[PDB]
Amino acid sequence: STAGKVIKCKAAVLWEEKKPFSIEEVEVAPPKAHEVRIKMVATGICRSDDHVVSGTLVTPLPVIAGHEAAGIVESIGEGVTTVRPGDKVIPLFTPQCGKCRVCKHPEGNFCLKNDLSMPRGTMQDGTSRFTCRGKPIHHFLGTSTFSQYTVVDEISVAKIDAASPLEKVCLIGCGFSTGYGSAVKVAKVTQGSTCAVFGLGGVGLSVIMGCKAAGAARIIGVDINKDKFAKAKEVGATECVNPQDYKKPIQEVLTEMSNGGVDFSFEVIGRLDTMVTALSCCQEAYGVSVIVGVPPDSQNLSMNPMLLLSGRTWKGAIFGGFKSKDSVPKLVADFMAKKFALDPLITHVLPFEKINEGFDLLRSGESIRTILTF
Amino acid sequence: STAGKVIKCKAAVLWEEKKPFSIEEVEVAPPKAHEVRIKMVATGICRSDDHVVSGTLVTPLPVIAGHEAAGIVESIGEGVTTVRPGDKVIPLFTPQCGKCRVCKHPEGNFCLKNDLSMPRGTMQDGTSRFTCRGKPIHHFLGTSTFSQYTVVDEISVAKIDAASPLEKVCLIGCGFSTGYGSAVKVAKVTQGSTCAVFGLGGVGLSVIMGCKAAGAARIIGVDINKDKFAKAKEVGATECVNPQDYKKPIQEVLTEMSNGGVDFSFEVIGRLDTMVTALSCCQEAYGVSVIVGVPPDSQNLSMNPMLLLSGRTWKGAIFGGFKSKDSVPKLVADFMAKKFALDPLITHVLPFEKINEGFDLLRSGESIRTILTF
Numbered sequence: 001s002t003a004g005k006v007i008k009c010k011a012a013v014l015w016e017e018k019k020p021f022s023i024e025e026v027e028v029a030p031p032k033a034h035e036v037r038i039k040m041v042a043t044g045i046c047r048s049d050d051h052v053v054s055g056t057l058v059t060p061l062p063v064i065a066g067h068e069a070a071g072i073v074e075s076i077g078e079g080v081t082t083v084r085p086g087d088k089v090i091p092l093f094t095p096q097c098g099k100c101r102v103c104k105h106p107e108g109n110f111c112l113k114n115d116l117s118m119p120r121g122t123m124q125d126g127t128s129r130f131t132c133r134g135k136p137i138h139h140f141l142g143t144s145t146f147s148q149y150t151v152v153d154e155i156s157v158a159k160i161d162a163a164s165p166l167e168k169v170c171l172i173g174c175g176f177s178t179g180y181g182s183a184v185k186v187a188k189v190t191q192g193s194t195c196a197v198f199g200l201g202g203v204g205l206s207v208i209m210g211c212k213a214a215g216a217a218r219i220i221g222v223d224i225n226k227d228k229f230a231k232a233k234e235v236g237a238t239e240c241v242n243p244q245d246y247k248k249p250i251q252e253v254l255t256e257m258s259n260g261g262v263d264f265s266f267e268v269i270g271r272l273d274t275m276v277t278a279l280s281c282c283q284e285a286y287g288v289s290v291i292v293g294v295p296p297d298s299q300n301l302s303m304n305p306m307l308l309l310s311g312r313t314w315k316g317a318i319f320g321g322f323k324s325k326d327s328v329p330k331l332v333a334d335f336m337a338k339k340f341a342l343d344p345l346i347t348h349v350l351p352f353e354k355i356n357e358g359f360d361l362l363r364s365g366e367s368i369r370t371i372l373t374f
Numbered sequence: 375s376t377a378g379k380v381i382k383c384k385a386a387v388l389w390e391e392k393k394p395f396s397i398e399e400v401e402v403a404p405p406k407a408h409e410v411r412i413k414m415v416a417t418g419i420c421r422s423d424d425h426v427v428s429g430t431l432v433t434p435l436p437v438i439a440g441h442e443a444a445g446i447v448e449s450i451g452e453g454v455t456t457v458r459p460g461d462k463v464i465p466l467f468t469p470q471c472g473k474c475r476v477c478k479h480p481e482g483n484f485c486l487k488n489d490l491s492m493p494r495g496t497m498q499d500g501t502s503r504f505t506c507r508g509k510p511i512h513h514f515l516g517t518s519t520f521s522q523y524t525v526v527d528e529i530s531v532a533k534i535d536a537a538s539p540l541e542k543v544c545l546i547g548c549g550f551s552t553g554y555g556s557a558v559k560v561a562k563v564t565q566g567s568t569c570a571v572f573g574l575g576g577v578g579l580s581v582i583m584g585c586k587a588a589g590a591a592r593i594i595g596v597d598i599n600k601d602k603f604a605k606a607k608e609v610g611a612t613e614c615v616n617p618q619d620y621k622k623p624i625q626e627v628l629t630e631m632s633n634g635g636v637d638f639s640f641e642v643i644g645r646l647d648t649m650v651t652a653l654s655c656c657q658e659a660y661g662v663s664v665i666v667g668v669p670p671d672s673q674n675l676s677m678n679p680m681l682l683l684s685g686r687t688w689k690g691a692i693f694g695g696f697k698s699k700d701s702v703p704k705l706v707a708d709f710m711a712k713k714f715a716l717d718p719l720i721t722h723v724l725p726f727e728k729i730n731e732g733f734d735l736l737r738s739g740e741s742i743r744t745i746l747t748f
C-alpha cells in the first residue's frame with residue numbers, strides 16, 4: 001500500500017453472526033470524491049462491536065466491524081476541504097453535515113445522515129470500498145476500523161492535534177466522550193448530587209468521571225462483577241453496590257441509600273430490565289434517568305406511565321449528544337491539556353491479529369478496554 | 375354559620391364505583407389543630423373526578439370527590455396566620471410544606487406530603503372530617519370540594535385577589551394551570567416550534583395556550599371529536615386532526631406534516647397508546663413529550679428503548695410543575711391583568727346537585743368545562 005489506486009491490506013471480517021473474526025486479505029478501493037481513506041494505527045473494543053457478532057445490533061453482514069478508532073490519512077477525494085493527508089484524524093460513527101434541521105438545531109447531535117437507525121451497510125452512495133475474495137464486504141455504520149485501511153466519507157472524519165497519543169486518544173471516537181457527555185450534556189449532573197451508574201465498564205467509568213467533574217457529591221456504581229468496583233472507586237466512584245449481594249430488589253436499596261432516589265442515574269449496559277430499574281431508583285418529582293446503552297433489537301420494556309407522571313425526565317443519547325465534527329477535535333486539546341485521563345480505562349493493548357482474545361476479555365469477563373494496535 | 379363546632383350540609387357522595395353521586399346530607403366537623411373550613415362558591419368537573427368513578431383512579435371509598443374549586447373561609451384552626459376567616463381560597467390537591475425535598479428543591483412540584491401517589495382517605499392527622507350517615511366519609515386529595523363545606527389542611531389551601539371571580543378562577547386549581555404549566559414550565563415550549571397536542575378538551579386547551587404564549591407558530595391538536603376543533607383555534611391551534619380520517623397511523627400523518635416530526639408533543643388524554651404515539655411523534659433526536667394525562671390503574675405500556683436512545687426526552691408532571699402555595703396566588707393575579715383567558719374553556723355553569731349532569735356532559739362531548747355554582 002499507499003497510493004491513489006486499490007490498496008491490498010489486512011482486516012477482520014465477520015462472515016457470520018456468532019463466529020469469531022477471520023483476519024484476511026481485502027482490497028480497499030481508492031476514495032470517491034469527498035471521501036478520505038485513512039491508514040489505521042489503533043482501535044477500541046466497544047460492546048456495540050460485539051452486539052454485532054451476536055446480532056443484538058443488526059447491520060448487513062458480511063462486514064468489517066469496528067468504529068472507535070484513530071489513524072492517519074493518505075488519500076482524500078474531490079473537493080475535500082476539512083482534512084489534508086499525513087493528518088491524524090479520528091473516524092465518526094455518528095456524522096455531521098449542514099442542513100438537516102438536526103445538524104442545525106442547538107440541541108441535536110444525531111445527524112439525519114447516519115446509518116445507525118436502519119442500516120444499509122455501505123458507503124454514503126450505497127456502495128462498498130471493501131472487496132474480499134471477490135465479494136464486497138460491508139462497512140459498519142460508516143467507519144469500519146478493523147481493517148488496516150478504511151474509506152470513510154468527509155462528513156464523518158474529525159481532525160485532531162498532530163502530537164496526539166492515538167494509542168490513547170482513540171477512546172474519544174466513542175468510549176470516553178459518550179459516557180462523559182452523558183453525565184455533563186444529556187443529563188447535566190447538578191453541582192453536588194447523587195448519581196447512580198449501572199454498569200461499570202469502559203463507557204460507564206467516563207459517565208462516573210463526568211459526574212465527578214459535574215460536582216456530584218455522591219456517586220454509586222452497580223455492577224454484578226465486584227471485580228469492577230476498584231477501577232471505579234479509583235475514577236471517583238464513592239459507593240459501589242452489587243445487586244447480587246442483596247435479598248430485596250435493587251431499586252429499593254438504591255432508593256434507601258439516597259432514600260427518595262438519586263438525582264441522576266444512568267444505564268450503560270443496555271438491558272430492558274435495568275433500563276427501567278434505573279428509572280425506578282431516582283426521584284418521582286425531579287429524577288432525571290438517562291440511557292446510554294443499546295438493547296437487544298426490537299425489544300419492548302414493560303413500564304408504568306405513572307413512573308414518569310410525578311416528574312421524571314427520561315432521555316437517551318448516542319454519543320454524549322456531542323455534535324460529532326466540532327466536538328471530537330475540541331475534546332482532544334483537553335486531554336492533551338490534562339482535562340481528563342484516558343489511562344485508568346485501558347486494561348490491555350493487544351496486537352491487531354489477536355483481536356479475537358480482545359473480545360474474549362471484554363465478554364469473557366473482566367478487563368475493560370483493550371486497544372488493538374495495527 | 376355560626377362556626378365553632380360541626381355542621382351539616384349537602385354533599386355529593388360516591389358510595390360505589392360505577393354509580394352516580396348522591397347528594398346526601400353530610401355532617402362536616404370543625405377545623406382541627408391547624409386546618410381551615412371553607413364554604414364553597416364554585417367547582418369544575420375535571421376528568422380525574424370521573425376516574426374515581428370508573429375504577430381507574432383509586433382512592434378509597436366511600437368519598438366526596440372534587441379538587442377544582444374556589445371559596446371563602448369560615449373557620450380557621452390553631453397555629454395559623456396563612457388564611458383568616460372570610461377570605462377567598464383555592465383548595466390545592468398537590469400540597470406544599472416547605473418541609474420536604476421536593477418542596478425545598480427549586481424544581482420539585484410533587485411535595486411528598488400528598489394522597490395521589492398512595493391515596494389514603496386522608497387527613498394528614500390520619501382522620502375522619504366527614505360522616506355521611508353514622509359512617510365516616512373519606513376525603514379526595516387534601517380537599518373534597520363536592521360538598522357545600524369542606525375542611526382542608528392549611529398546607530393544601532391558598533389566599534387569593536380579594537376582588538377575584540370564584541366562578542372564573544376555580545379553574546386555576548387544575549384545568550388551566552396544568553394545561554399551561556405543562557407547556558411553559560415542564561416542556562419549556564420554545565418559540566418558532568411546532569407542538570402537537572393530544573386531547574382537545576379541559577386541560578389540553580390550556581396547553582394549546584402556553585404553546586401560544588411560550589411563543590410558537592404551529593400547534594396541531596389531535597382529537598376524535600371533530601366538534602372539539604374550534605375552541606382549539608379560538609384559543610391557539612392552526613391545524614386540527616382526526617386519527618379516523620386516516621388509513622395510515624396518526625403517528626405518520628403527523629410526522630410528515632412537521633415532516634421530520636414535531637418538536638414538542640403533549641398528551642392530555644390518559645390513553646396508554648396515545649402516550650406512545652406521541653413519544654414517537656416528536657424529533658427522534660431532540661423532541662420533548664410531556665405526559666399530562668392520568669392512565670388506567672396499574673396497567674403498563676410497551677415501547678422499545680430506541681425511541682428514547684435517539685434523543686427524544688420523555689418527561690411527565692402533575693399540576694403543571696407549578697409549586698402549590700406560590701403560584702395559584704400570582705396566577706389568579708395574572709387573570710386580573712387580563713394576562714390570559716378562562717372562558718373559551720367553560721361551556722356550562724350548572725348549579726350543584728345538577729352535577730350528575732355535568733359529568734353526563736363530559737362523557738358525551740357537549741361539555742368542556744361545566745362549572746358547578748353552589
Ligand SMILES: NC(=O)c1ccc[n+]([C@@H]2O[C@H](COP(=O)([O-])OP(=O)(O)OC[C@H]3O[C@@H](n4cnc5c(N)ncnc54)[C@H](O)[C@@H]3O)[C@@H](O)[C@H]2O)c1
Pocket residue numbers: 045046047048049051174175178198199200201202203204222223224225228268269270271274291292293294317318319320362368
Ligand atoms: N449511546 C451510545 O452512543 C453508546 C456509545 C457506546 C456504548 N454504548 C453501549 O453502552 C454499553 C456499554 O458499553 P461498554 O463498551 O462499556 O460495554 P461493556 O460490556 O464493557 O460494559 C457492560 C458493563 O455492565 C455490567 N453489567 C452486566 N450485566 C449487568 C447487570 N445486570 N447489572 C449491572 N451491571 C451489569 C458489566 O459487568 C460491565 O461492566 C454497551 O451496550 C454499548 O453498546 C452506547
Ligand SMILES: NC(=O)c1ccc[n+]([C@@H]2O[C@H](COP(=O)([O-])OP(=O)(O)OC[C@H]3O[C@@H](n4cnc5c(N)ncnc54)[C@H](O)[C@@H]3O)[C@@H](O)[C@H]2O)c1
Pocket residue numbers: 420421422425548549552572573574575576577578596597598599602617642643644645648666667668669691692693694736742
Ligand atoms: N397530570 C395532572 O395533574 C392532570 C390534571 C388534569 C387532568 N389530567 C388528566 O388529563 C386528561 C385530560 O383531562 P380533560 O379534563 O381535559 O378531559 P376531557 O374529557 O375534556 O378531554 C378528553 C379528550 O380527548 C379526546 N380523546 C380521547 N381519546 C382520544 C383518542 N384516542 N384520540 C384522540 N383524542 C382522544 C376526547 O374526545 C376528549 O375530548 C385526563 O385523563 C385527566 O385525568 C391530569
Ligand SMILES: [Zn+2]
Pocket residue numbers: 095096097098099100102103110111112113
Ligand atoms: Zn446532519
Ligand SMILES: [Zn+2]
Pocket residue numbers: 046047048067068174175
Ligand atoms: Zn462505541
Ligand SMILES: [Zn+2]
Pocket residue numbers: 469470471472473474475476477478484485486487
Ligand atoms: Zn413539600
Ligand SMILES: [Zn+2]
Pocket residue numbers: 420421422441442547548549
Ligand atoms: Zn384536575
